[PDB]
Design a protein around this ligand. Structure first.
Ligand code: CL
Ligand code: NA
Length: 215
């Protein structure tokens, strides 16, 4: 069994669930064009780019598609950003890791400002040394790039004591490009099919099981 000293976490689907704010932001946008939808029917739009949702599903023209994105962003910045749910038991495991002296980092494709806002909202920002996401109104940053960035801040030499925790293949692919171990979680947005096919170092069903691998 290996002793990991640096643990990286993705945000959405790993630490916190953004379902409420994302679906409500889409609903608000659709409403702006007179389209009524139940939030349950918008869950499937958590993940793909908004362009695909408005263009491929709602068949909005390129111009109407940008107006839809603007309305989404308006609601998200105002209220959507505060509509997240922390996964049950995550605060406890972060506290346990931190108290054992592990360095905890966030490496996410979500904009940094949003990641920091959310971690601050749940009073868990304090457990992370560095938090790295993408730029607001910028290009979505790839996972290997944000993982490398955050390790470089720690001036890491022994990459064997580093591990990435995430709920999507993108987290595992990122980890493999960097040459670090990974935990693929199943309680987020990645299916067992997806996670198992990405071949992470470990697979966990729930938050509590993270303890068994890291401690
Ligand atoms: Cl990557
Ligand atoms: Na995620």
């Amino acid at each position: 069994k290996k002793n990991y000293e640096i643990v990286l976490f993705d945000l959405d689907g790993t630490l916190t669930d953004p379902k409420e704010g994302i679906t409500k932001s889409i609903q608000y946008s659709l409403n702006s064009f007179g389209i009524k939808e139940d939030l349950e029917n918008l869950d499937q739009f958590i993940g793909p780019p908004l362009h695909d949702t408005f263009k491929e599903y709602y068949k909005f023209e390129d111009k109407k598609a940008k107006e839809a994105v603007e309305k989404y962003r308006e609601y998200f910045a105002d209220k959507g950003i505060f509509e997240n749910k922390i996964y049950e038991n995550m605060k406890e495991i972060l506290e346990m890791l931190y108290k054992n002296g592990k360095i905890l980092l966030v490496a996410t494709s979500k904009p940094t400002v949003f990641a920091e806002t959310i971690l601050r909202y749940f009073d868990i920002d304090r457990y992370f040394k560095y938090i790295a996401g993408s730029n607001l109104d910028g290009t979505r940053v790839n996972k290997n790039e944000v993982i490398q960035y955050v390790l470089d801040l720690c001036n890491v030499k022994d990459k064997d004591k580093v591990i990435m925790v995430g709920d999507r293949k993108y987290d595992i692919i990122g980890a493999k490009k960097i040459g670090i171990d990974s935990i693929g979680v199943l309680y987020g947005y990645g299916s067992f099919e997806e996670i198992s096919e990405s071949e992470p170092t470990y697979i966990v069903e729930n938050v509590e099981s993270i303890k068994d691998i890291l401690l």
